[PDB]
Amino acid sequence: SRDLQNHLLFETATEVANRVGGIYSVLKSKAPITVAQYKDHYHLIGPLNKATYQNEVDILDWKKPEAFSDEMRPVQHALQTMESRGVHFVYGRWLIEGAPKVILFDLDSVRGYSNEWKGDLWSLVGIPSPENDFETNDAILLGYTVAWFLGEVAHLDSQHAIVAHFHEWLAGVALPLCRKRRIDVVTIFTTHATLLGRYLCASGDFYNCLESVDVDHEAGRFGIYHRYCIERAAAHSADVFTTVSQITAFEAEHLLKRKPDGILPNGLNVIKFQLHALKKEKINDFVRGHFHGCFDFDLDNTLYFFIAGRYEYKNKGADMFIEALARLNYRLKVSGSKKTVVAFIVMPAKNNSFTVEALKGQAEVRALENTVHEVTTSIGKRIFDHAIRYPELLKSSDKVMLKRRILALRRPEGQLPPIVTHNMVDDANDLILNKIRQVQLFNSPSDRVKMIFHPEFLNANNPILGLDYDEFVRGCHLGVFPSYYEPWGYTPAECTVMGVPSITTNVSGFGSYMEDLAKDYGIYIVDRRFKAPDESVEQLVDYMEEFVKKTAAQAINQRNRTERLSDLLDWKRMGLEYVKARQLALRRGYPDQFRELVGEELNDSNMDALA
Amino acid sequence: EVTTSIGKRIFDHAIRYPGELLKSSDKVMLKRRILALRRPEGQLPPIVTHNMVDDANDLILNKIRQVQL
Amino acid sequence: EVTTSIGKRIFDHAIRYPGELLKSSDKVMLKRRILALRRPEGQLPPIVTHNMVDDANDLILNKIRQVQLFNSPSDRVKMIFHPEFLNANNPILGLDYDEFVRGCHLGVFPSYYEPWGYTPAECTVMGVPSITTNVSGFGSYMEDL
Numbered sequence: 032s033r034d035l036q037n038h039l040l041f042e043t044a045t046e047v048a049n050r051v052g053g054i055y056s057v058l059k060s061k062a063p064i065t066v067a068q069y070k071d072h073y074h075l076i077g078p079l080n081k082a083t084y085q086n087e088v089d090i091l092d093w094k095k096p097e098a099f100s101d102e103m104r105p106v107q108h109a110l111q112t113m114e115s116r117g118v119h120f121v122y123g124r125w126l127i128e129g130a131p132k133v134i135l136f137d138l139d140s141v142r143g144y145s146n147e148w149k150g151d152l153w154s155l156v157g158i159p160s161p162e163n164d165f166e167t168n169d170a171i172l173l174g175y176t177v178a179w180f181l182g183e184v185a186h187l188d189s190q191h192a193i194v195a196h197f198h199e200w201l202a203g204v205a206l207p208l209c210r211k212r213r214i215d216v217v218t219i220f221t222t223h224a225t226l227l228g229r230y231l232c233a234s235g236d237f238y239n240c241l242e243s244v245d246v247d248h249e250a251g252r253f254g255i256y257h258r259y260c261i262e263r264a265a266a267h268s269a270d271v272f273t274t275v276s277q278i279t280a281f282e283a284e285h286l287l288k289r290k291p292d293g294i295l296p297n298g299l300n301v302i303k304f305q306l307h308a309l310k311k312e313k314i315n316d317f318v319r320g321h322f323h324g325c326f327d328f329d330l331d332n333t334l335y336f337f338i339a340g341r342y343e344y345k346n347k348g349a350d351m352f353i354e355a356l357a358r359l360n361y362r363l364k365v366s367g368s369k370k371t372v373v374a375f376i377v378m379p380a381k382n383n384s385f386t387v388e389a390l391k392g393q394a395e396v397r398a399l400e401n402t403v404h405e406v407t408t409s410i411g412k413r414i415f416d417h418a419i420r421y422p423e424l425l426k427s428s429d430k431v432m433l434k435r436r437i438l439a440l441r442r443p444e445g446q447l448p449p450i451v452t453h454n455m456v457d458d459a460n461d462l463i464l465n466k467i468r469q470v471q472l473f474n475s476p477s478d479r480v481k482m483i484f485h486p487e488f489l490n491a492n493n494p495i496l497g498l499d500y501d502e503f504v505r506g507c508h509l510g511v512f513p514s515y516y517e518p519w520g521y522t523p524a525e526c527t528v529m530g531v532p533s534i535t536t537n538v539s540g541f542g543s544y545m546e547d548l549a550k551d552y553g554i555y556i557v558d559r560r561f562k563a564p565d566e567s568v569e570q571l572v573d574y575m576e577e578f579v580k581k582t583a584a585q586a587i588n589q590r591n592r593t594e595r596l597s598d599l600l601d602w603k604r605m606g607l608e609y610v611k612a613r614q615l616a617l618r619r620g621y622p623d624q625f626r627e628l629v630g631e632e633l634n635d636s637n638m639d640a641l642a
Numbered sequence: 643e644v645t646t647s648i649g650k651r652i653f654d655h656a657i658r659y660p661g662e663l664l665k666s667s668d669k670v671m672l673k674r675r676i677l678a679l680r681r682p683e684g685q686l687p688p689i690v691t692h693n694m695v696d697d698a699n700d701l702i703l704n705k706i707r708q709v710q711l
Numbered sequence: 712e713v714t715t716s717i718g719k720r721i722f723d724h725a726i727r728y729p730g731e732l733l734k735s736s737d738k739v740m741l742k743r744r745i746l747a748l749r750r751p752e753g754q755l756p757p758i759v760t761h762n763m764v765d766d767a768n769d770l771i772l773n774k775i776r777q778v779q780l781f782n783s784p785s786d787r788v789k790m791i792f793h794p795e796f797l798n799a800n801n802p803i804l805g806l807d808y809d810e811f812v813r814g815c816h817l818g819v820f821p822s823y824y825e826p827w828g829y830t831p832a833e834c835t836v837m838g839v840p841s842i843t844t845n846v847s848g849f850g851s852y853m854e855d856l
């Protein structure tokens with residue numbers, strides 16, 4: 032009979048101290064708020080990565096009597112048992128804000144027990160396991176080791192109730208074992224996507240006919256069956272099953288055959304972020320160097336649109352984006368509009384650094400600034416010296432350098448401002464370039480929406496666009512993330528957090544979530560679940576157009592409105608959902624003792640049901 | 643202020659490609675600041691910067707008075 | 712960041728009147744930034760900064776390979792090859808040529824054929840000690856003063 036009020040927390044994931052996924056970010060940014068609650072009762076467990084762990088972990092000596100409070104002693108004895116038997120790990124602090132404690136199992140040290148295990152898995156959960164699949168071998172090694180570790184703790188610790196949270200299938204194998212071996216931990220499984228989900232949306236339809244596919248057959252079709260099984264197995268053996276977003280919980284329910292008990296939306300460390308004019312000026316400098324020799328539009332009357340993130344052409348809706356811009360370009364010409372949209376695509380691709388062309392633009396426009404500056408301070412000296420001595424200001428010397436620097440801006444006749452800043456390592460086959468070719472946005476003066484593809488991360492130290500992403504983002508006016516497959520979507524959310532209006536969609540997790548909290552707040556939500564592809568694109572252009580019109584006041588209102596939506600996404604608020612999930616795990620594990628702590632039988636069908 | 647105004651104008655021109663650069667607005671305020679430097683006729687730049695609490699007796703002033711610098 | 716945090720704390724204390732000044736928060740991020748500087752064991756600081764489009768054949772690299780100046784700690788002169796013009800706007804050496812030259816201590820221009828050698832000459836005009844030769848034009852010229 033253990034203590035529910037004073038329990039342990041073990042969070043397991045392949046990403047604990049190695050950025051191999053976006054979960055690394057979730058766990059790292061959730062640390063401070065859970066370490067605040069659990070202090071040293073909380074551990075992250077994960078596979079030791081021998082290449083990186085040394086840069087991220089404050090390696091600790093776990094044997095010193097001091098390394099553990101007396102009550103937390105059981106974990107320490109637990110770990111020794113484990114090393115006795117030949118399992119090698121690293122105990123330490125993960126050097127991130129919050130400095131949570133970490134247990135990093137060495138998958139080589141246990142690789143022997145491999146076969147005994149691929150087998151013991153099949154004979155308690157009929158999960159297959161070919162030997163050519165390293166990720167699943169690694170996922171099985173990890174699974175057995177952690178269940179082991181948790182077994183021990185469950186054994187030696189008898190004061191604390193023990194909850195153990197697993198993220199994503201690669202850390203799922205422990206989950207069946209725990210249920211099978213009646214181990215006295217309460218489990219939770221969070222999936223941040225599904226395998227079928229991803230693989231199905233990797234060609235070019237889903238959200239409609241997803242509720243009618245033969246999962247067993249489709250998994251087979253991708254050579255994914257065993258992985259699929261691990262993912263399902265984990266989803267059913269958990270005491271609480273969850274996903275990051277409403278939309279994913281829909282795909283989960285029908286693809287893994289269990290309706291999630293709840294949603295665990297990803298929050299951020301809002302302080303970590305919290306200017307527009309100041310940063311918009313750096314983007315102005317870039318635009319001038321890029322359209323040098325044919326700068327025919329008013330920056331005071333131009334708007335910066337952007338899309339960013341992993342280069343996933345279809346899934347991130349890079350296609351919808353470019354298309355909609357072509358259609359926004361027509362609408363803008365026909366409407367005879369006075370405004371200009373410069374639209375950046377910041378998505379990294381195989382490249383050979385900056386194009387000689389783009390580098391020149393910036394350098395010549397920099398020499399102009401330099402020369403103008405030198406010339407104006409001269410006038411300064413001369414006007415002043417005149418006024419003080421009391422009783423054409425340009426000498427010819429200055430005229431000459433001025434003239435030279437303006438001549439250098441002239442660009443080859445008929446040559447247009449490039450649609451790309453880098454040397455593409457595949458100009459022929461690149462999905463983005465080809466799409467912007469198909470629609471002929473080539474940056475001619477008639478064209479009211481201009482196009483800039485920047486196939487590389489933004490660093491402030493670049494010759495071209497001297498911004499850090501966080502700087503660039505604030506400098507902009509609207510972020511546009513028309514995603515088709517996107518379980519959460521950090522880039523939209525973080526865009527919002529920095530107080531920049533943004534378009535998402537309702538098949539995005541962050542979209543779906545936002546949809547329950549309209550457009551006045553800086554969040555537009557295109558419908559991809561219900562409207563047809565074309566109606567969708569058109570809705571996008573409607574949103575874009577509407578935004579182009581916004582007057583000074585209409586925009587500066589919206590901006591202030593989104594900047595206040597900010598505090599809704601901090602873990603301080605979102606983290607209460609983890610609490611709902613963990614508690615539900617207790618209520619289901621110790622139904623009787625829970626009634627004693629609460630004062631009745633609260634409902635246990637979902638997390639919202641409880642609270 | 644006036645010169646940086648000029649700067650903006652020279653740069654904007656240049657960056658756009660394809661004689662009084664001082665507008666009237668700027669000539670007015672220049673002319674005003676120049677006139678406010680005029681000193682009352684026959685007034686010379688003082689030999690001292692402070693109010694002397696004993697102007698007449700002071701050794702230093704009186705000596706430079708005596709040499710009429 | 713960490714030091715200005717310290718400043719604020721020392722000042723606030725003082726102004727209020729009437730030992731670890733680094734909180735844990737600040738020790739974590741310091742410790743992380745120090746570890747990210749660790750280099751893969753036995754890795755030495757490269758002799759070249761760029762990707763060579765012909766690494767094997769290059770005369771310069773091959774010569775410094777032949778003299779085995781590989782930047783190991785024992786070595787008392789280090790070797791840095793920068794096969795590109797210097798530009799103030801670079802991620803690596805953020806200097807215009809003229810800046811970089813001024814910041815150095817001694818220019819070395821051991822020319823064999825060189826009817827003038829503007830490079831040494833302009834090195835000297837920026838006030839920097841320099842080694843030329845007597846088969847350099849600028850050298851020869853200097854030798855007569």
Ligand SMILES: OC[C@H]1O[C@H](O[C@H]2[C@H](O)[C@@H](O)[C@@H](O[C@H]3[C@H](O)[C@@H](O)[C@@H](O[C@H]4[C@H](O)[C@@H](O)[C@@H](O)O[C@@H]4CO)O[C@@H]3CO)O[C@@H]2CO)[C@H](O)[C@@H](O)[C@@H]1O
Nearest residue numbers: 147148151175178179180181182183185186212213214215
């Ligand atoms: O469930 C009832 C039992 O619960 C308590 O037992 C403890 C054991 O005393 C511990 O020894 C340990 O069991 C571990 C085991 O040590 C570990 O090696 C691993 O064993 C797996 C094996 O790796 C796998 O290949 C296969 O053969 O299955 C084995 C387990 O059957 O994992 C075990 C489970 O964690 O921890 C448990 C935790 O419950 C209680 O003390 C017992 O009396 C009781 O019967």
Ligand SMILES: OC[C@H]1O[C@H](O[C@H]2[C@H](O)[C@@H](O)[C@@H](O[C@H]3[C@H](O)[C@@H](O)[C@@H](O[C@H]4[C@H](O)[C@@H](O)[C@@H](O)O[C@@H]4CO)O[C@@H]3CO)O[C@@H]2CO)[C@H](O)[C@@H](O)[C@@H]1O
Nearest residue numbers: 386388445446447448449450451453454455458464468473
């Ligand atoms: O306006 C004059 C010209 O108009 C037409 O040229 C168009 C091309 O047809 C368009 O395809 C496009 O060209 C792009 C090109 O598509 C794009 O890949 C990129 O080229 C980069 C290259 O990726 C990079 O690796 C490196 O080599 O630098 C190149 C740029 O210097 O950007 C091009 C320019 O936007 O747009 C041009 C016009 O600008 C017509 O075909 C031409 O004959 C005519 O001169």
